[PDB]
Amino acid sequence: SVQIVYKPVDLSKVTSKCGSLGNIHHKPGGGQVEVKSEKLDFKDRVQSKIGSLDNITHVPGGGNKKIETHKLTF
Amino acid sequence: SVQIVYKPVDLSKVTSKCGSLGNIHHKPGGGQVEVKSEKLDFKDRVQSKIGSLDNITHVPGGGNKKIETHKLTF
Amino acid sequence: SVQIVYKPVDLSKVTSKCGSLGNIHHKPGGGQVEVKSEKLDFKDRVQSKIGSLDNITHVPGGGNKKIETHKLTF
Amino acid sequence: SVQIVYKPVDLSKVTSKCGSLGNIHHKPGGGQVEVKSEKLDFKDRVQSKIGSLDNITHVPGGGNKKIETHKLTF
Amino acid sequence: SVQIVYKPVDLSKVTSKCGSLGNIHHKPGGGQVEVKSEKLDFKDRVQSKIGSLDNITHVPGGGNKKIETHKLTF
Amino acid sequence: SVQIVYKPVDLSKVTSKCGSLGNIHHKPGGGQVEVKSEKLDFKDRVQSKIGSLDNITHVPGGGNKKIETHKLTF
């Protein structure tokens, strides 16, 4: 006979406590771009991007993360 | 017989306490770009990216992470 | 007869405490780029990147990490 | 008096047996070419061929040639 | 008086047996080429070929040639 | 008086047996060729070839050649 009994337990206090968050990006950017091309002749899937500025700003008022995974296999 | 009994137990406090925060990027950037290209002849999948300022500003008011995993196998 | 009894127990306080955080990046960047290119003939998958200020800024108000893993196998 | 009697026989079994016969040509790459030729001044007959990638792929389910030759002469 | 009585015989079993016969060519890269030729001045018949990758793949399920020759002569 | 009676016989078994027969050519490389040439002044018949990678892959499920020759002569 085979038996499995499986009971994972968590009590977690994953937290943050911020008294005053803040962020500024003051007068960023600038810069010319040129791209010039001839007979580029791609033979499979392409992606491009072009530009003076990219600005991924990501500012959570607390941004905590919890990740878990339970498996079993006979 | 094959008995298995499995119980993980966690009590956790995973925290950040932060009396103030701040983040200033001030006049970042500038810079010209040129790309000149000829007879390039790519033969599998391409990604390109071209540009003067690429800012990425990830700034949580606490950004704590808990990552866990449980397995079993025969 | 086989028996396994498996009980890991944790009480943890993985934490941080900051009186006042702060970050400044002040007038960063500048710098021309040129990429002239000719007769390159790439036979397989390509990533290119070109640019004048590539700023990944990552500033959590405490950024604690806990990483955990439980196994069993026959 | 002269006579020729010529009575050849051949009964030969000439065979092959196979299973899962095949080919693969995953991504033949060829390449870039250039033929900046000048003042070549050919005084007699020419044949030419130019290209990135030239292929022959020949796959008979048996190539079992039987080839013969017979003569008589005074 | 003269006579010839020529009576050759052949019974030959010629065979092969196979299973899972095959090929792989996987990403044959070839290459860049260049033929900057000048004033070549050929006084007689020419044949030429240029190119990055040249391939012959040849895969008979059997190649079992039987080849013969017979003569007679006064 | 003359006579020739000529009675050759052949009974030959000629075989091969195989399993999982085949070839692999994984990433053949070739190269960055160049043939700059000048004032060559050929006085005679020519044949030429140029390229980065030249391949033959010949893979019979059997190669079992039987090759023969017969004569008669006064």
* DSSP label of C3: E
CB atoms within 10 A of CB E34: 18
Contact D33 E45 (CB under 8 A): no
Residues 6 or more apart whose Cβ sits within 8 Å of residue D6: D72, E4, E6, E72
Residues 6 or more apart whose Cβ sits within 8 Å of residue A37: B35, B36, B37, B38, B40
For residues E9 and F9, the answer to whether their CB atoms sit within 8 Å is yes
SS (H, E, C) chain A: CEEEEECCEEEEEEEEEECCCCCEEECCECCCEEEEEECCCCCCCEECCEEEEEEEEECCCCCCEEECCECCCC
The end-to-end CA distance of chain B, in Å, is 14
- Residues D25, C39, D33: CA angle, nearest 5 degrees: 55
Instruction: Using alpha carbons, select from E34, F51, E37, E49 the residue that is nearest to residue D41.
Output: E37
Separation between Cα atoms, residue B8 and residue E7, nearest integer Å: 92
Name the minimum distance, in Å, from the CA of E10 to any CA of chain D: 5
Name the minimum distance, in Å, from the CA of D33 to any CA of chain C: 9
Contact E52 D30 (CB under 8 A): yes
* DSSP label of D56: E
Separation between Cα atoms, residue D28 and residue F28, nearest integer Å: 10
Contact D31 C41 (CB under 8 A): yes
Separation between Cα atoms, residue D1 and residue E3, nearest integer Å: 8
For residues F29 and E30, the answer to whether their CB atoms sit within 8 Å is no
Q: Which residue of B has its CA nearest to C19?
A: B19
Q: Hey, which residues 40-69 in chain F have their CB within 8 Å of chain E?
A: 40-69
- Burial class from Cβ neighbours inside 10 Å (0-12, 13-18, 19+) for residue B14 reads buried
Strand A50-58, strand B50-58: pairing: parallel
The end-to-end CA distance of chain F, in Å, is 14
Structure tokens at C22: 């702060």
Q: For residue C8, give the nearest of B8, B22, B27 by CB distance.
A: B8
Four-point Cα dihedral A40, A43, A46, A51, nearest 10: 0
CB atoms within 10 A of CB B28: 26
F22 touches D at CB < 8 Å: no
Q: Which helix (H) or strand (E) element contains residue F59?
A: none
The strand pairing partners of E17, in sequence order, are D17, F17
Q: Do chains A and F touch (3 or more CB pairs under 8 A)?
A: no
Q: Amino acid letter at B32? A: Q
Residues in E touching D50 (Cβ below 8 Å)? 49-51
The end-to-end CA distance of chain A, in Å, is 14
Four-point Cα dihedral A15, A16, A17, A23, nearest 10: -150
SS (H, E, C) C42-65: CCCCEECCEEEEEEEEECCCCCCE
Q: Which helix (H) or strand (E) element contains residue C16?
A: strand C15-18
Q: For residue F22, give the nearest of E23, E43, E50 by CB distance.
A: E23
User: Any idea which residue has 């010629």 for tokens?
Assistant: E14
User: Any idea which residue has 């960023």 for tokens?
Assistant: A28
Resolution in angstroms, to 1 decimal, for this deposition? 3.4
Q: What φ, ψ does residue D2 adopt, rounded to 5°?
A: -135, 140
Instruction: Using alpha carbons, select from B66, B12, B1, B55 the residue that is nearest to residue B30.
Output: B55
Q: How far is CA A72 from CA B6, C74, D16, in A?
A: 12, 12, 51
User: Any idea which residue has 């500012």 for tokens?
Assistant: A59
Residues in C touching D32 (Cβ below 8 Å)? 39, 41
For residues C68 and B68, the answer to whether their CB atoms sit within 8 Å is yes
Residues in F touching D22 (Cβ below 8 Å)? none
Q: Locate all alpha helices (DSSP H) within B1-74, ordered by sequence.
A: none
Structure tokens at B5: 């009994």
Q: For residue F62, give the nearest of D16, D21, D31 by CB distance.
A: D16
Residues 6 or more apart whose Cβ sits within 8 Å of residue F7: E7, E8, E9
Cα–chain-centroid distance for residue D47?
20
Residues in C touching A16 (Cβ below 8 Å)? 61-62
Q: How far is CA D4 from CA E4, F2, F69, in A?
A: 5, 12, 19
Residues in D touching B42 (Cβ below 8 Å)? none
Separation between Cα atoms, residue C64 and residue B63, nearest integer Å: 7
The strand pairing partners of C46, in sequence order, are B46
Q: Amino acid letter at C63? A: G
Q: How far is CA C51 from CA A31, A55, C56, E62, in A?
A: 10, 14, 13, 59
Name the minimum distance, in Å, from the CA of D43 to any CA of chain F: 10
- Taking one residue from A and the other from C, the number of pairs with CB-CB distance under 8 angstroms is 6
D28 touches C at CB < 8 Å: no
Contact E18 F19 (CB under 8 A): yes
How was this structure obtained? cryo-EM
Name the minimum distance, in Å, from the CA of E74 to any CA of chain D: 5
Q: Which helix (H) or strand (E) element contains residue B16?
A: strand B9-18
CB atoms within 10 A of CB F45: 13
* DSSP label of B29: B
For residues A16 and B21, the answer to whether their CB atoms sit within 8 Å is no
User: What is residue D55's three-state secondary structure?
Assistant: strand
